[PDB]
Amino acid sequence: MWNRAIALAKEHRLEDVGQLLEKYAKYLIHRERLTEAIELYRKAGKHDEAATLLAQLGKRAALRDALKAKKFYVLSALEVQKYRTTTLDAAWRGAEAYHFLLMCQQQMADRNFKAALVLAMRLIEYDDLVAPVDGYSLIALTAYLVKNFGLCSKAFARLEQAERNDEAPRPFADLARHIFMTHSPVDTSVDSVPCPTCGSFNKEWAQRCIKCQQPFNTCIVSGCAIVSEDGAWQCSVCHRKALEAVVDKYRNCPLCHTP
Amino acid sequence: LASADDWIWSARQRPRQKQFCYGTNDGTISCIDITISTVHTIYDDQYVFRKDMTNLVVHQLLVDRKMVIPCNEYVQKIATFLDKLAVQLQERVIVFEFFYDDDRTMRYQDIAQIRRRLECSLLCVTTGAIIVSNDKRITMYDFQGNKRREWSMESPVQLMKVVGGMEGREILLVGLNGGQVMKVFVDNPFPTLLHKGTAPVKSAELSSSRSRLAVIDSTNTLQVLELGEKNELLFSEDNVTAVAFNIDVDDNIAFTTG
Amino acid sequence: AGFQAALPRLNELDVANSWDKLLRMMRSEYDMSCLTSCLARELDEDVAWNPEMLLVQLTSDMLDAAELQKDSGEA
Amino acid sequence: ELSVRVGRALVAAHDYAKAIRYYQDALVTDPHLSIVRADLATLQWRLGHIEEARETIVASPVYEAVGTAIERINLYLLLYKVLRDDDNHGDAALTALLTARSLRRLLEHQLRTTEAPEVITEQRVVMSRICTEAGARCIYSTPAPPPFSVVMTDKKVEAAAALAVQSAIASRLTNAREYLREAIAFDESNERAQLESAQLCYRTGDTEGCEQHCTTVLRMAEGSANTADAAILLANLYTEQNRDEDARNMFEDLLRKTPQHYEALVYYLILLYHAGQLPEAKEALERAAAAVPIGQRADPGLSYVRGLYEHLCNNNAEALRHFNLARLPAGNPWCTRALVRMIRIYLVPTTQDLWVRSTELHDNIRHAEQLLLLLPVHSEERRILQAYCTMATRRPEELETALHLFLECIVAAETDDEDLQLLASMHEAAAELAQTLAFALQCKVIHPEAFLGLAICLFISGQETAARNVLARLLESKDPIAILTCSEDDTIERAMLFEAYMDTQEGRLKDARFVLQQVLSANEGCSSAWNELGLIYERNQKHKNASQCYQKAWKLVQEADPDVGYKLGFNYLRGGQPVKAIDVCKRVLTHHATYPRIEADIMDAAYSMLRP
């Protein structure tokens, strides 16, 4: 009962306060037993270390399947919120990235390739977490599916760059040649998002105003930037927004999974 | 009961004796003796056992009461704590509760069913949750069937026994092949070390005041020690087959030797 | 006489293999297989996540994953 | 020096005609910059403009300092790469070799300038690689293919051209001998050159140079990613010499070195299936499975190996499960092969294949085509398996579509309503492509699987004589070395099985037994061959050996086939052991409960004559 153990050392203080908890935590981590250290820190009243450990578990789970990494990252974000109640929203980054890693794909499962494209373009914001090859392959896939070849070319170029990088045996070259022999690299992407201040039209996946540099928030389920709060649902747990016309089928927040 | 090579053409029991004999297809006639093995539980004076391989006979000893629970399927493991009973069947786990009617006749009611095929070496019922244990893992489930907690030990678990506590925070007692006797609180995820033995622990019980401990090793050697920061040994006696502590008296031990 | 064995359905082999539908349209012209090595095997559903229950489920699943290989006793 | 940078950032935007125009303009501005020549030639070749790339190479002034000769040899090898598709193709490589050998001046430079040790020996491995590529070019590429579009009926000059081409390719082979010995002499670290030389030694139909060189591959190819290519040839050689145990042991210790070598694992598995020692691979599979770091999802190679092992034991359900787990992620090197295996399983689930004489069939072919649509459209395997899926339906119009598809295949080789919509559209596409028979009879038998598919189409459709002709033409190639191969390809063996099936309908059985003994000496696990030899034993009334080989087949099948189980139960009934017949029929029903005629023909009489 380390939380109360440390809190108990209050009268006159003591010559020693805790510091065996850190020893047991080092023992647990060195022994490779993972979740026991998380529980030890969570009972210890130190949710930041538990959040870090859950982030490590998410990193390790990412290589096998994205859903497990998503679960561990939303868990770590919740632990950080517990610490705050006990860069601010950066604790949620690892969530949303992997959330997009599913969400875009889900919209491809529904043959709704437009919102899938916008989510794929939103995937670029987390290049540190997800592999750039993964995200840009998804971007090129979505762009090819909607027959918009401008973003398709802009993603294929990065794919070819990475393929030339890893050599220092090329299917990206064959794909680019076969897709640009017949279809020209035309960028058919309309701007249908007005800044609240300037009023100029930005792209759907804009993270900020193109000129006013005022920050934007993105739709969780469709990916498009949000500018009007008349149709902006919010989740109280994760403090994220969504659009009513596409979130009405969601009994719980798709990011943190809370009704 | 037994397996032959080819088709077993006939099998007949010896009348009025625990023995049968079967003749197979490959010209082999074999006779098998049968020794009945009994599963049993005892808490305070309540004592439950398996009769006819399908019924649970529960007997309050000091009051001389008895009733029969027809589970209708083969019973594998039984556990008992306070007014709670757990029966591990072939495909379910049934949790009964004992109660008295207006006429002061004790009755049993089945209060929980867990339709999960569970594999474990040890089973322990408690006030609101059941606990199963296999090899290294101890998993505690609620009465519906959802998991509640799990512990991974250092050695395979040989003994597991509820020694009582507050509701939802009941103590357990676990013995490991490494000689570790530990308290597994059902609310905590971290066992607390009581005894570090040099042999696998076959049986161990806690005192009524829980300030003293009796440990039976793999060599049938019993050690009773005073628990604390270091378990000060009180006495040791060899060739012990079983031990029990006095529920009502602190310093009163009863052990049966070989 | 002719007899053909009853083999499992394609969706029986994997429940979240809906890409089988999707991949059957794009391939109408040529092969884009270097782009399709990124689709996740499973898919997210519409559920709610309790933190403690989810962590317990993750711990139990990792322990079962270890014990599936540990049942053979190889070391 | 920034014109190339402009061109590269220009092709990054994926404008290819504009890149051609810009590079040609910068070439007219300065035709003495070789880098833009190379880039323009490469781009023109990649877009299918071979002639324009050749014009770019020829128009170069180059086509003496070190750099000038370096650009000379680079231009020559680039020209060869463009002309990878005869005498014309090899000339560029030969001239590159000659200029590289003259590049004497390298010796005069390095032996006195005291250059770096890395840069002294760097220009030796390159020459060895050029020689190796020349040797491989002579071995593999054939100046053979003529147009032969009907043409005037010639007396001799066509045969004169044919024998001239034969002399030409023999000369290419004997010149490749010199090229490869030069390659291995100039660099012994070229594992690829040692492999090419071993392949050449095996190629020439020799019985001495084979054991001289292509047996020494353990010393030659010590360890690399291409060791599987060495191992297949070594195993085929050993099986030709009946040195089976050495073939076992080399796989044993090579997999001891690398537990995760999935292609060598596949070769090991198919070797054991040939030897009948299938369970001996279980420890190898366990070592591969435990070779994973901490667990995790099975790698596609591991899953394919597991599925192949299950399929060879007639455990088709787990085979399908593991093969389906193999295709993830898609586009992996096994994904095409895993898909082919899945389509094969859905096509032939039992030992009985398509050449035998229906909601389960419709569901099976439906799943087969749903998987088939995952294959690349331009792939040959998809083009032949589409005909296979169409001919599976046994519908005569589908038979005609499959026949025309296979004829198209051999000719080309010589030179959820949306899913149902896609199925229907591909059916219509096959129908319209179906709207050449003598082409099968006269052309070179280059594509064996298409020949087998055409033959079984002819047999199912009713024309037995034409099927005999086309399959005899297919198997006059090797008739044996081909069966003794430790390879995944088993089209030759399936052709042998079909020949046995056809001969069983002719009233003669001696040649069928000849074929069966050949294939079973090559492959002890051929359960269908055991079944057929047992059946012809049943015709010969030799029932004891028939029952013995049926027990062999039943063991190999693992008691999961209705037809060999049916005949085994019938033999037990004739042998008067109804308990064994009841056991066999109960296994048949617990595995394939819907098989007809089983109970009413075996179980009833077994119950009736259990206690006479």
Ligand SMILES: [Zn+2]
């Ligand atoms: Zn603005």
Ligand SMILES: [Zn+2]
């Ligand atoms: Zn939320």
